[PDB]
Write a protein that binds this ligand. Structure first.
Ligand SMILES: Cc1cc(OCCCc2c(C(=O)O)[nH]c3cc(Cl)ccc23)cc(C)c1Cl
Ligand SMILES: OC[C@H]1O[C@H](O[C@H]2[C@H](O)[C@@H](O)[C@@H](O)O[C@@H]2CO)[C@H](O)[C@@H](O)[C@@H]1O
Ligand SMILES: [Mg+2]
Ligand SMILES: [Mg+2]
Ligand code: NA
Length: 516
Protein backbone atom coordinates (compact mmCIF):
# COMPACT_ATOMS: atom_id res chain seq x y z
CA UNK A 1 0.00 0.00 0.00
CA UNK A 2 0.86 3.69 -0.27
CA UNK A 3 -0.28 4.80 3.17
CA UNK A 4 2.47 4.51 5.80
CA UNK A 5 2.10 1.81 8.44
CA UNK A 6 2.36 2.56 12.14
CA UNK A 7 1.30 6.20 12.20
CA UNK A 8 -1.88 8.24 11.74
CA UNK A 9 -2.54 10.98 9.19
CA UNK A 10 -5.78 12.90 9.78
CA UNK A 11 -7.48 15.40 7.45
CA UNK A 12 -10.09 17.90 8.68
CA UNK A 13 -11.54 21.04 7.07
CA UNK A 14 -9.91 24.40 7.70
CA UNK A 15 -12.96 25.92 9.41
CA UNK A 16 -12.89 23.32 12.22
CA UNK A 17 -10.87 23.12 15.45
CA UNK A 18 -7.82 21.41 13.96
CA UNK A 19 -5.43 22.72 16.61
CA UNK A 20 -7.69 21.22 19.27
CA UNK A 21 -7.78 17.99 17.29
CA UNK A 22 -3.97 18.07 17.13
CA UNK A 23 -3.92 18.29 20.95
CA UNK A 24 -5.90 15.03 21.03
CA UNK A 25 -3.39 13.57 18.58
CA UNK A 26 -0.54 14.64 20.86
CA UNK A 27 -2.15 12.79 23.79
CA UNK A 28 -2.35 9.65 21.63
CA UNK A 29 1.29 10.14 20.66
CA UNK A 30 2.35 10.59 24.30
CA UNK A 31 0.71 7.29 25.31
CA UNK A 32 1.90 5.18 22.39
CA UNK A 33 5.02 6.60 20.76
CA UNK A 34 2.98 6.63 17.54
CA UNK A 35 3.09 9.74 15.34
CA UNK A 36 -0.18 11.58 14.67
CA UNK A 37 -0.37 14.33 12.07
CA UNK A 38 -3.37 16.61 11.55
CA UNK A 39 -3.69 18.51 8.26
CA UNK A 40 -6.36 20.80 6.80
CA UNK A 41 -5.98 20.54 3.02
CA UNK A 42 -7.52 23.03 0.63
CA UNK A 43 -10.67 21.70 -1.12
CA UNK A 44 -10.55 18.72 1.20
CA UNK A 45 -13.86 17.24 0.10
CA UNK A 46 -12.52 16.93 -3.47
CA UNK A 47 -8.89 16.16 -2.61
CA UNK A 48 -9.76 13.14 -0.46
CA UNK A 49 -11.57 11.12 -3.15
CA UNK A 50 -8.87 12.03 -5.69
CA UNK A 51 -6.05 10.59 -3.58
CA UNK A 52 -8.02 7.74 -1.97
CA UNK A 53 -9.05 6.45 -5.40
CA UNK A 54 -5.37 5.66 -5.92
CA UNK A 55 -5.06 3.91 -2.55
CA UNK A 56 -3.41 6.94 -0.98
CA UNK A 57 -4.32 9.76 1.39
CA UNK A 58 -5.03 10.13 5.11
CA UNK A 59 -5.92 7.33 7.49
CA UNK A 60 -8.85 9.39 8.83
CA UNK A 61 -11.01 11.85 6.92
CA UNK A 62 -13.39 14.37 8.56
CA UNK A 63 -16.36 15.91 6.76
CA UNK A 64 -20.10 16.31 7.15
CA UNK A 65 -21.79 12.95 6.63
CA UNK A 66 -23.38 13.88 3.28
CA UNK A 67 -20.22 13.20 1.27
CA UNK A 68 -19.47 9.83 2.85
CA UNK A 69 -22.04 7.84 0.87
CA UNK A 70 -20.24 8.72 -2.35
CA UNK A 71 -16.91 7.82 -0.81
CA UNK A 72 -18.30 4.47 0.35
CA UNK A 73 -19.91 3.79 -3.04
CA UNK A 74 -16.45 4.32 -4.56
CA UNK A 75 -14.84 1.87 -2.13
CA UNK A 76 -12.84 4.55 -0.34
CA UNK A 77 -14.02 3.85 3.23
CA UNK A 78 -13.64 1.03 5.71
CA UNK A 79 -16.75 -0.36 7.39
CA UNK A 80 -16.45 0.65 11.02
CA UNK A 81 -17.13 -1.86 13.81
CA UNK A 82 -17.89 -0.21 17.14
CA UNK A 83 -19.01 -2.65 19.79
CA UNK A 84 -22.46 -2.32 21.35
CA UNK A 85 -21.22 -0.48 24.42
CA UNK A 86 -19.48 2.16 22.33
CA UNK A 87 -22.47 2.54 20.01
CA UNK A 88 -24.75 3.13 22.99
CA UNK A 89 -22.57 6.12 24.01
CA UNK A 90 -23.75 8.16 21.00
CA UNK A 91 -27.27 9.23 20.00
CA UNK A 92 -28.87 6.69 17.64
CA UNK A 93 -29.84 9.32 15.04
CA UNK A 94 -26.18 10.29 14.65
CA UNK A 95 -25.31 6.66 13.76
CA UNK A 96 -28.22 6.78 11.28
CA UNK A 97 -26.47 9.65 9.45
CA UNK A 98 -23.38 7.50 8.85
CA UNK A 99 -25.14 4.31 7.74
CA UNK A 100 -24.89 3.49 4.02
CA UNK A 101 -26.40 0.37 2.43
CA UNK A 102 -26.88 -1.04 5.93
CA UNK A 103 -23.27 -0.56 7.03
CA UNK A 104 -21.71 2.04 9.32
CA UNK A 105 -19.11 3.96 7.29
CA UNK A 106 -17.95 6.62 9.78
CA UNK A 107 -17.95 7.76 13.40
CA UNK A 108 -20.37 10.61 14.04
CA UNK A 109 -18.89 13.54 15.97
CA UNK A 110 -21.32 16.47 16.14
CA UNK A 111 -24.55 17.88 14.75
CA UNK A 112 -24.22 21.11 12.75
CA UNK A 113 -26.99 23.53 11.83
CA UNK A 114 -26.85 27.11 10.63
CA UNK A 115 -28.33 29.82 12.84
CA UNK A 116 -28.95 33.53 12.59
CA UNK A 117 -26.10 35.31 14.38
CA UNK A 118 -26.80 38.92 15.27
CA UNK A 119 -25.12 41.91 16.86
CA UNK A 120 -27.20 42.88 19.91
CA UNK A 121 -25.72 46.37 20.00
CA UNK A 122 -26.90 47.14 16.44
CA UNK A 123 -29.98 44.98 16.31
CA UNK A 124 -31.38 44.16 19.76
CA UNK A 125 -34.46 42.48 18.32
CA UNK A 126 -33.55 40.42 15.27
CA UNK A 127 -36.08 40.07 12.40
CA UNK A 128 -38.51 37.15 12.55
CA UNK A 129 -38.94 37.36 8.76
CA UNK A 130 -36.77 37.64 5.66
CA UNK A 131 -39.33 40.06 4.27
CA UNK A 132 -38.51 42.77 6.79
CA UNK A 133 -34.78 42.68 6.01
CA UNK A 134 -34.82 45.22 3.12
CA UNK A 135 -36.42 47.91 5.34
CA UNK A 136 -34.06 47.05 8.19
CA UNK A 137 -31.09 47.38 5.84
CA UNK A 138 -32.32 50.85 4.82
CA UNK A 139 -32.47 51.90 8.48
CA UNK A 140 -29.02 50.50 9.21
CA UNK A 141 -27.45 51.99 6.06
CA UNK A 142 -28.37 55.43 7.39
CA UNK A 143 -26.03 54.65 10.30
CA UNK A 144 -23.21 53.28 8.14
CA UNK A 145 -24.18 49.64 8.77
CA UNK A 146 -25.76 46.80 6.79
CA UNK A 147 -28.42 44.32 7.91
CA UNK A 148 -27.01 41.01 6.69
CA UNK A 149 -23.87 39.45 5.21
CA UNK A 150 -23.25 35.75 4.67
CA UNK A 151 -21.36 33.44 2.31
CA UNK A 152 -23.06 33.51 -1.09
CA UNK A 153 -20.42 31.26 -2.70
CA UNK A 154 -21.52 28.01 -0.99
CA UNK A 155 -25.13 26.86 -1.41
CA UNK A 156 -25.16 25.47 2.14
CA UNK A 157 -25.84 29.01 3.37
CA UNK A 158 -28.58 29.90 0.87
CA UNK A 159 -30.32 26.51 1.02
CA UNK A 160 -32.38 27.33 4.14
CA UNK A 161 -34.11 30.17 2.25
CA UNK A 162 -34.55 28.04 -0.91
CA UNK A 163 -36.16 25.28 1.15
CA UNK A 164 -38.40 27.63 3.14
CA UNK A 165 -41.42 27.87 0.81
CA UNK A 166 -41.06 24.38 -0.60
CA UNK A 167 -37.77 23.86 -2.40
CA UNK A 168 -36.21 20.44 -1.74
CA UNK A 169 -33.34 18.30 -2.96
CA UNK A 170 -34.57 14.72 -3.03
CA UNK A 171 -38.16 14.15 -1.90
CA UNK A 172 -38.47 12.89 1.69
CA UNK A 173 -41.78 12.01 3.29
CA UNK A 174 -41.31 9.53 6.19
CA UNK A 175 -39.14 7.30 2.66
CA UNK A 176 -37.11 8.92 -0.07
CA UNK A 177 -38.09 9.27 -3.69
CA UNK A 178 -34.72 10.04 -5.27
CA UNK A 179 -36.30 10.40 -8.72
CA UNK A 180 -38.30 13.34 -7.31
CA UNK A 181 -36.15 16.50 -7.25
CA UNK A 182 -37.48 19.87 -6.07
CA UNK A 183 -34.66 22.21 -7.02
CA UNK A 184 -36.61 24.18 -9.63
CA UNK A 185 -40.13 24.22 -8.17
CA UNK A 186 -42.10 27.36 -7.29
CA UNK A 187 -40.83 27.40 -3.70
CA UNK A 188 -37.18 27.19 -4.70
CA UNK A 189 -37.73 29.91 -7.29
CA UNK A 190 -39.41 32.17 -4.73
CA UNK A 191 -36.55 31.83 -2.25
CA UNK A 192 -33.76 32.34 -4.76
CA UNK A 193 -35.61 35.26 -6.36
CA UNK A 194 -35.85 36.92 -2.94
CA UNK A 195 -32.09 36.50 -2.56
CA UNK A 196 -31.40 37.94 -6.03
CA UNK A 197 -33.74 40.85 -5.26
CA UNK A 198 -31.74 41.63 -2.11
CA UNK A 199 -28.67 41.91 -4.34
CA UNK A 200 -30.43 43.96 -7.02
CA UNK A 201 -31.59 46.42 -4.35
CA UNK A 202 -28.09 46.72 -2.88
CA UNK A 203 -28.90 45.02 0.42
CA UNK A 204 -26.30 42.34 -0.36
CA UNK A 205 -23.35 41.88 -2.76
CA UNK A 206 -23.05 38.81 -5.02
CA UNK A 207 -19.29 38.61 -4.35
CA UNK A 208 -19.65 38.19 -0.57
CA UNK A 209 -17.89 35.02 0.57
CA UNK A 210 -17.06 33.36 3.88
CA UNK A 211 -14.10 35.58 4.78
CA UNK A 212 -15.79 38.84 3.75
CA UNK A 213 -18.97 38.14 5.73
CA UNK A 214 -17.04 36.92 8.79
CA UNK A 215 -14.83 40.02 8.81
CA UNK A 216 -17.79 42.38 8.40
CA UNK A 217 -19.69 40.81 11.26
CA UNK A 218 -16.70 40.59 13.57
CA UNK A 219 -15.76 44.24 12.83
CA UNK A 220 -19.30 45.36 13.70
CA UNK A 221 -20.13 46.50 10.16
CA UNK A 222 -23.10 44.20 9.54
CA UNK A 223 -25.87 43.45 12.05
CA UNK A 224 -26.39 39.81 11.05
CA UNK A 225 -24.69 36.82 9.55
CA UNK A 226 -25.64 33.16 8.94
CA UNK A 227 -23.13 30.59 10.13
CA UNK A 228 -22.55 27.49 12.19
CA UNK A 229 -21.06 26.84 15.61
CA UNK A 230 -17.44 26.74 14.35
CA UNK A 231 -17.73 30.50 13.80
CA UNK A 232 -18.43 31.41 17.45
CA UNK A 233 -14.78 31.34 18.60
CA UNK A 234 -13.72 34.15 16.30
CA UNK A 235 -16.76 36.23 17.30
CA UNK A 236 -15.81 35.72 20.98
CA UNK A 237 -12.34 37.05 20.18
CA UNK A 238 -13.78 40.08 18.33
CA UNK A 239 -15.73 41.04 21.48
CA UNK A 240 -18.93 41.68 19.51
CA UNK A 241 -22.03 41.41 21.71
CA UNK A 242 -23.72 38.63 19.74
CA UNK A 243 -26.74 36.38 19.94
CA UNK A 244 -27.58 33.12 18.19
CA UNK A 245 -31.20 32.62 17.20
CA UNK A 246 -33.77 31.05 14.87
CA UNK A 247 -33.40 31.81 11.17
CA UNK A 248 -36.00 34.20 9.73
CA UNK A 249 -39.17 32.80 8.13
CA UNK A 250 -39.99 33.25 4.46
CA UNK A 251 -43.63 33.50 3.31
CA UNK A 252 -44.48 32.53 6.89
CA UNK A 253 -42.49 29.28 6.70
CA UNK A 254 -39.34 28.38 8.68
CA UNK A 255 -36.00 28.50 6.91
CA UNK A 256 -34.91 24.90 6.68
CA UNK A 257 -31.18 24.29 7.02
CA UNK A 258 -29.65 21.11 5.66
CA UNK A 259 -28.27 19.54 8.84
CA UNK A 260 -24.82 17.97 8.80
CA UNK A 261 -23.22 15.47 11.11
CA UNK A 262 -19.46 16.07 11.26
CA UNK A 263 -18.09 12.54 10.89
CA UNK A 264 -14.77 10.68 10.82
CA UNK A 265 -14.19 7.98 8.22
CA UNK A 266 -11.33 5.50 7.93
CA UNK A 267 -9.57 5.16 4.55
CA UNK A 268 -10.21 1.73 3.00
CA UNK A 269 -6.53 1.71 1.99
CA UNK A 270 -5.23 2.42 5.51
CA UNK A 271 -3.01 -0.24 7.09
CA UNK A 272 -3.77 1.48 10.40
CA UNK A 273 -7.48 0.84 10.77
CA UNK A 274 -7.18 -0.51 14.35
CA UNK A 275 -5.01 2.48 15.36
CA UNK A 276 -7.63 4.79 13.85
CA UNK A 277 -10.40 3.03 15.76
CA UNK A 278 -8.47 3.38 19.01
CA UNK A 279 -7.88 7.06 18.39
CA UNK A 280 -11.47 7.83 17.49
CA UNK A 281 -13.18 5.75 20.19
CA UNK A 282 -10.80 6.19 23.10
CA UNK A 283 -9.30 9.64 22.55
CA UNK A 284 -11.57 11.82 20.42
CA UNK A 285 -15.08 10.58 21.31
CA UNK A 286 -14.59 11.19 25.02
CA UNK A 287 -15.55 14.15 27.20
CA UNK A 288 -11.95 15.35 27.28
CA UNK A 289 -11.29 14.81 23.57
CA UNK A 290 -14.39 16.64 22.42
CA UNK A 291 -13.73 19.44 24.90
CA UNK A 292 -10.25 19.95 23.42
CA UNK A 293 -11.70 20.37 19.93
CA UNK A 294 -14.75 22.35 21.12
CA UNK A 295 -12.56 24.85 23.01
CA UNK A 296 -10.75 25.55 19.73
CA UNK A 297 -13.83 25.90 17.48
CA UNK A 298 -17.24 24.82 18.77
CA UNK A 299 -18.53 21.54 17.36
CA UNK A 300 -22.25 22.10 17.78
CA UNK A 301 -24.43 19.45 19.45
CA UNK A 302 -22.04 16.55 19.94
CA UNK A 303 -22.94 12.92 19.28
CA UNK A 304 -21.50 11.77 22.63
CA UNK A 305 -24.38 11.72 25.13
CA UNK A 306 -22.28 12.37 28.23
CA UNK A 307 -20.73 15.59 26.89
CA UNK A 308 -23.83 16.81 25.06
CA UNK A 309 -25.64 16.83 28.40
CA UNK A 310 -23.26 19.68 29.34
CA UNK A 311 -23.27 21.52 26.01
CA UNK A 312 -27.07 21.45 25.79
CA UNK A 313 -27.25 24.01 28.60
CA UNK A 314 -25.73 26.62 26.23
CA UNK A 315 -28.40 28.86 24.67
CA UNK A 316 -26.30 28.94 21.48
CA UNK A 317 -26.60 25.16 21.26
CA UNK A 318 -30.34 25.32 22.03
CA UNK A 319 -30.69 27.74 19.10
CA UNK A 320 -28.58 25.42 16.93
CA UNK A 321 -30.92 22.53 17.63
CA UNK A 322 -34.04 24.66 17.17
CA UNK A 323 -32.86 25.46 13.66
CA UNK A 324 -31.82 21.83 13.14
CA UNK A 325 -35.32 20.65 14.05
CA UNK A 326 -36.85 22.97 11.42
CA UNK A 327 -34.50 21.57 8.78
CA UNK A 328 -33.55 18.11 7.60
CA UNK A 329 -30.58 15.76 8.04
CA UNK A 330 -28.80 15.63 4.67
CA UNK A 331 -29.00 12.50 2.56
CA UNK A 332 -25.81 10.58 1.90
CA UNK A 333 -26.79 9.23 -1.52
CA UNK A 334 -23.71 9.06 -3.77
CA UNK A 335 -24.80 11.96 -6.00
CA UNK A 336 -24.93 14.48 -3.15
CA UNK A 337 -21.73 16.11 -4.44
CA UNK A 338 -23.36 16.57 -7.87
CA UNK A 339 -26.46 18.07 -6.22
CA UNK A 340 -24.30 20.53 -4.32
CA UNK A 341 -22.25 21.47 -7.40
CA UNK A 342 -25.46 22.01 -9.36
CA UNK A 343 -27.04 24.29 -6.75
CA UNK A 344 -23.72 26.10 -6.14
CA UNK A 345 -23.61 27.06 -9.81
CA UNK A 346 -27.28 28.08 -9.85
CA UNK A 347 -26.96 30.41 -6.87
CA UNK A 348 -23.78 32.04 -8.18
CA UNK A 349 -25.18 32.44 -11.70
CA UNK A 350 -28.48 33.83 -10.45
CA UNK A 351 -26.76 36.21 -8.02
CA UNK A 352 -24.36 37.52 -10.69
CA UNK A 353 -27.02 37.79 -13.38
CA UNK A 354 -25.27 35.23 -15.59
CA UNK A 355 -28.56 33.30 -15.62
CA UNK A 356 -32.12 34.14 -14.68
CA UNK A 357 -33.34 32.41 -11.52
CA UNK A 358 -35.63 30.18 -13.61
CA UNK A 359 -32.91 29.01 -16.02
CA UNK A 360 -30.32 28.65 -13.23
CA UNK A 361 -32.58 26.36 -11.21
CA UNK A 362 -33.66 24.38 -14.32
CA UNK A 363 -29.97 23.55 -14.85
CA UNK A 364 -29.51 22.62 -11.19
CA UNK A 365 -32.58 20.38 -11.40
CA UNK A 366 -31.14 18.58 -14.42
CA UNK A 367 -27.72 18.25 -12.78
CA UNK A 368 -29.25 16.87 -9.60
CA UNK A 369 -31.43 14.37 -11.48
CA UNK A 370 -28.73 13.16 -13.82
CA UNK A 371 -27.47 10.14 -11.91
CA UNK A 372 -30.77 8.57 -10.89
CA UNK A 373 -32.46 9.21 -14.22
CA UNK A 374 -29.51 7.95 -16.26
CA UNK A 375 -29.31 4.86 -14.06
CA UNK A 376 -32.99 4.08 -14.60
CA UNK A 377 -32.63 4.33 -18.40
CA UNK A 378 -29.33 2.47 -18.59
CA UNK A 379 -30.29 -0.28 -16.13
CA UNK A 380 -33.59 -0.89 -17.89
CA UNK A 381 -31.92 -1.06 -21.29
CA UNK A 382 -29.14 -3.42 -20.18
CA UNK A 383 -31.62 -5.72 -18.43
CA UNK A 384 -34.15 -5.92 -21.28
CA UNK A 385 -31.30 -6.46 -23.74
CA UNK A 386 -29.99 -9.33 -21.61
CA UNK A 387 -33.35 -11.06 -21.11
CA UNK A 388 -35.26 -10.01 -24.23
CA UNK A 389 -38.18 -8.76 -22.13
CA UNK A 390 -38.93 -5.19 -21.07
CA UNK A 391 -39.52 -4.12 -17.49
CA UNK A 392 -43.25 -3.66 -16.97
CA UNK A 393 -42.89 -1.39 -13.90
CA UNK A 394 -43.93 2.29 -14.12
CA UNK A 395 -41.06 4.78 -14.69
CA UNK A 396 -42.06 7.10 -11.84
CA UNK A 397 -41.04 10.76 -11.53
CA UNK A 398 -39.95 12.42 -14.80
CA UNK A 399 -41.42 9.27 -16.33
CA UNK A 400 -42.13 10.75 -19.75
CA UNK A 401 -38.47 11.72 -20.17
CA UNK A 402 -37.19 8.35 -18.95
CA UNK A 403 -39.69 6.50 -21.13
CA UNK A 404 -38.98 8.49 -24.32
CA UNK A 405 -35.22 8.26 -23.70
CA UNK A 406 -35.47 4.47 -23.43
CA UNK A 407 -37.59 4.37 -26.61
CA UNK A 408 -34.98 6.49 -28.42
CA UNK A 409 -32.12 4.39 -27.05
CA UNK A 410 -33.79 1.19 -28.28
CA UNK A 411 -34.16 2.61 -31.78
CA UNK A 412 -30.72 4.18 -32.13
CA UNK A 413 -28.95 1.45 -30.14
CA UNK A 414 -30.29 -1.26 -32.45
CA UNK A 415 -28.37 0.22 -35.38
CA UNK A 416 -25.28 0.89 -33.30
CA UNK A 417 -25.14 -2.68 -32.00
CA UNK A 418 -25.73 -4.09 -35.50
CA UNK A 419 -22.97 -1.99 -37.09
CA UNK A 420 -20.57 -2.46 -34.16
CA UNK A 421 -21.15 -6.19 -33.59
CA UNK A 422 -17.69 -7.21 -34.82
CA UNK A 423 -16.00 -4.39 -32.90
CA UNK A 424 -17.96 -5.26 -29.75
CA UNK A 425 -17.13 -8.98 -30.04
CA UNK A 426 -13.46 -8.08 -30.34
CA UNK A 427 -13.46 -5.74 -27.36
CA UNK A 428 -15.38 -8.23 -25.23
CA UNK A 429 -12.86 -10.99 -26.03
CA UNK A 430 -9.99 -8.64 -25.19
CA UNK A 431 -11.50 -7.55 -21.86
CA UNK A 432 -12.35 -11.10 -20.73
CA UNK A 433 -15.17 -10.14 -18.35
CA UNK A 434 -15.96 -13.21 -16.24
CA UNK A 435 -17.39 -11.95 -12.95
CA UNK A 436 -18.23 -9.11 -10.58
CA UNK A 437 -14.60 -8.32 -9.80
CA UNK A 438 -13.91 -8.02 -13.54
CA UNK A 439 -16.85 -5.61 -13.89
CA UNK A 440 -15.44 -3.44 -11.08
CA UNK A 441 -12.25 -2.91 -13.10
CA UNK A 442 -14.09 -1.57 -16.14
CA UNK A 443 -14.57 2.00 -14.88
CA UNK A 444 -10.93 2.99 -15.51
CA UNK A 445 -11.05 1.52 -19.03
CA UNK A 446 -14.34 3.27 -19.83
CA UNK A 447 -13.06 6.63 -18.62
CA UNK A 448 -9.93 6.28 -20.77
CA UNK A 449 -11.85 5.53 -23.98
CA UNK A 450 -14.79 7.87 -23.38
CA UNK A 451 -13.14 11.04 -22.02
CA UNK A 452 -11.08 12.12 -25.04
CA UNK A 453 -12.55 14.09 -27.94
CA UNK A 454 -15.81 15.81 -28.88
CA UNK A 455 -18.91 14.61 -27.02
CA UNK A 456 -22.06 13.79 -28.94
CA UNK A 457 -25.10 11.61 -28.37
CA UNK A 458 -23.81 9.00 -30.82
CA UNK A 459 -20.80 8.28 -28.60
CA UNK A 460 -23.04 8.05 -25.56
CA UNK A 461 -25.21 5.52 -27.40
CA UNK A 462 -22.06 3.51 -28.23
CA UNK A 463 -21.05 3.54 -24.54
CA UNK A 464 -24.44 2.24 -23.46
CA UNK A 465 -24.75 -0.16 -26.43
CA UNK A 466 -21.47 -1.87 -25.60
CA UNK A 467 -22.83 -2.06 -22.05
CA UNK A 468 -25.87 -3.90 -23.39
CA UNK A 469 -23.57 -6.22 -25.37
CA UNK A 470 -21.61 -7.00 -22.19
CA UNK A 471 -24.87 -7.46 -20.26
CA UNK A 472 -26.06 -10.09 -22.76
CA UNK A 473 -22.74 -11.88 -22.31
CA UNK A 474 -23.04 -11.82 -18.50
CA UNK A 475 -26.54 -13.29 -18.76
CA UNK A 476 -25.33 -16.01 -21.14
CA UNK A 477 -22.62 -17.16 -18.72
CA UNK A 478 -24.90 -17.20 -15.65
CA UNK A 479 -23.58 -13.93 -14.19
CA UNK A 480 -26.85 -12.04 -14.52
CA UNK A 481 -26.32 -10.53 -11.06
CA UNK A 482 -23.40 -8.51 -12.48
CA UNK A 483 -25.66 -6.52 -14.77
CA UNK A 484 -26.74 -4.03 -12.12
CA UNK A 485 -23.19 -3.13 -11.00
CA UNK A 486 -22.30 -2.83 -14.71
CA UNK A 487 -25.16 -0.36 -15.22
CA UNK A 488 -24.11 1.58 -12.11
CA UNK A 489 -20.52 1.80 -13.37
CA UNK A 490 -21.51 3.01 -16.84
CA UNK A 491 -23.90 5.56 -15.32
CA UNK A 492 -21.19 6.85 -12.98
CA UNK A 493 -18.75 7.28 -15.87
CA UNK A 494 -21.34 9.02 -18.05
CA UNK A 495 -22.63 11.57 -15.56
CA UNK A 496 -19.21 12.37 -14.08
CA UNK A 497 -17.20 12.77 -17.29
CA UNK A 498 -19.94 14.51 -19.30
CA UNK A 499 -21.75 16.44 -16.54
CA UNK A 500 -21.48 19.93 -18.09
CA UNK A 501 -22.26 18.75 -21.60
CA UNK A 502 -25.27 16.74 -20.41
CA UNK A 503 -26.72 19.74 -18.53
CA UNK A 504 -26.14 21.93 -21.58
CA UNK A 505 -28.22 19.50 -23.68
CA UNK A 506 -31.00 19.60 -21.06
CA UNK A 507 -30.11 16.04 -20.14
CA UNK A 508 -32.11 13.21 -21.62
CA UNK A 509 -34.63 15.64 -23.12
CA UNK A 510 -31.90 16.71 -25.54
CA UNK A 511 -31.25 13.08 -26.46
CA UNK A 512 -34.91 12.54 -27.33
CA UNK A 513 -35.02 15.71 -29.38
CA UNK A 514 -31.74 15.00 -31.20
CA UNK A 515 -32.93 11.64 -32.51
CA UNK A 516 -36.65 12.42 -33.02
C1 LIG B 1 -19.55 -0.88 -21.00
C2 LIG B 1 -18.32 -0.22 -21.69
C3 LIG B 1 -18.51 0.87 -22.52
C4 LIG B 1 -17.41 1.46 -23.14
O1 LIG B 1 -17.63 2.58 -23.99
C5 LIG B 1 -16.45 3.38 -24.28
C6 LIG B 1 -16.96 4.65 -24.97
C7 LIG B 1 -17.80 4.31 -26.20
C8 LIG B 1 -16.93 3.70 -27.32
C9 LIG B 1 -16.15 4.43 -28.24
C10 LIG B 1 -16.04 5.96 -28.32
O2 LIG B 1 -15.96 6.68 -27.29
O3 LIG B 1 -16.05 6.51 -29.45
N1 LIG B 1 -15.54 3.55 -29.06
C11 LIG B 1 -15.88 2.25 -28.70
C12 LIG B 1 -15.51 1.01 -29.23
C13 LIG B 1 -16.01 -0.18 -28.67
CL1 LIG B 1 -15.57 -1.74 -29.32
C14 LIG B 1 -16.88 -0.11 -27.58
C15 LIG B 1 -17.24 1.12 -27.05
C16 LIG B 1 -16.74 2.32 -27.62
C17 LIG B 1 -16.11 0.97 -22.95
C18 LIG B 1 -15.93 -0.12 -22.12
C19 LIG B 1 -14.50 -0.66 -21.89
C20 LIG B 1 -17.03 -0.71 -21.49
CL2 LIG B 1 -16.82 -2.08 -20.43
O1 LIG C 1 -22.16 24.45 0.21
C1 LIG C 1 -22.28 23.07 -0.09
C2 LIG C 1 -21.59 22.22 0.99
O2 LIG C 1 -22.43 22.21 2.12
C3 LIG C 1 -21.97 21.46 3.22
O3 LIG C 1 -20.70 21.91 3.63
C4 LIG C 1 -20.64 22.66 4.83
C5 LIG C 1 -20.16 21.74 5.95
O4 LIG C 1 -21.14 20.75 6.24
C6 LIG C 1 -19.93 22.55 7.22
O5 LIG C 1 -19.28 21.72 8.16
C7 LIG C 1 -19.04 23.74 6.94
O6 LIG C 1 -17.74 23.32 6.62
O7 LIG C 1 -19.52 24.50 5.86
C8 LIG C 1 -19.66 23.81 4.63
C9 LIG C 1 -20.20 24.83 3.62
O8 LIG C 1 -19.17 25.66 3.11
C10 LIG C 1 -21.88 20.00 2.80
O9 LIG C 1 -21.44 19.22 3.90
C11 LIG C 1 -20.89 19.93 1.65
O10 LIG C 1 -20.72 18.59 1.21
C12 LIG C 1 -21.37 20.80 0.49
O11 LIG C 1 -20.42 20.82 -0.56
MG1 LIG D 1 -30.52 24.99 -19.17
MG1 LIG E 1 -38.28 17.24 -16.14
NA1 NA F 1 -35.57 46.96 21.02
Amino acid sequence: GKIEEGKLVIWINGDKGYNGLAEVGKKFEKDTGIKVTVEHPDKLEEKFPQVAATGDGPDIIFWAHDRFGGYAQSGLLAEITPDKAFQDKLYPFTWDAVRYNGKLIAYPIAVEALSLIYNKDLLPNPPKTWEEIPALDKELKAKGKSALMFNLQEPYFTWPLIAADGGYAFKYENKYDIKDVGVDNAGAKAGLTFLVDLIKNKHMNADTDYSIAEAAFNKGETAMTINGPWAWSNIDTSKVNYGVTVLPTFKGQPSKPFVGVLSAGINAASPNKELAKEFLENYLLTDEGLEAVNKDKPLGAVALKSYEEELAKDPRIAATMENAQKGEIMPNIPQMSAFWYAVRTAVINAASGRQTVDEALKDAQTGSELYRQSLEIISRYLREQATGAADTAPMGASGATSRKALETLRRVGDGVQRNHETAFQGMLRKLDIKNEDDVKSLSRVMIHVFSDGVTNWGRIVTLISFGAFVAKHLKTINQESCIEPLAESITDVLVRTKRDWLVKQRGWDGFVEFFH
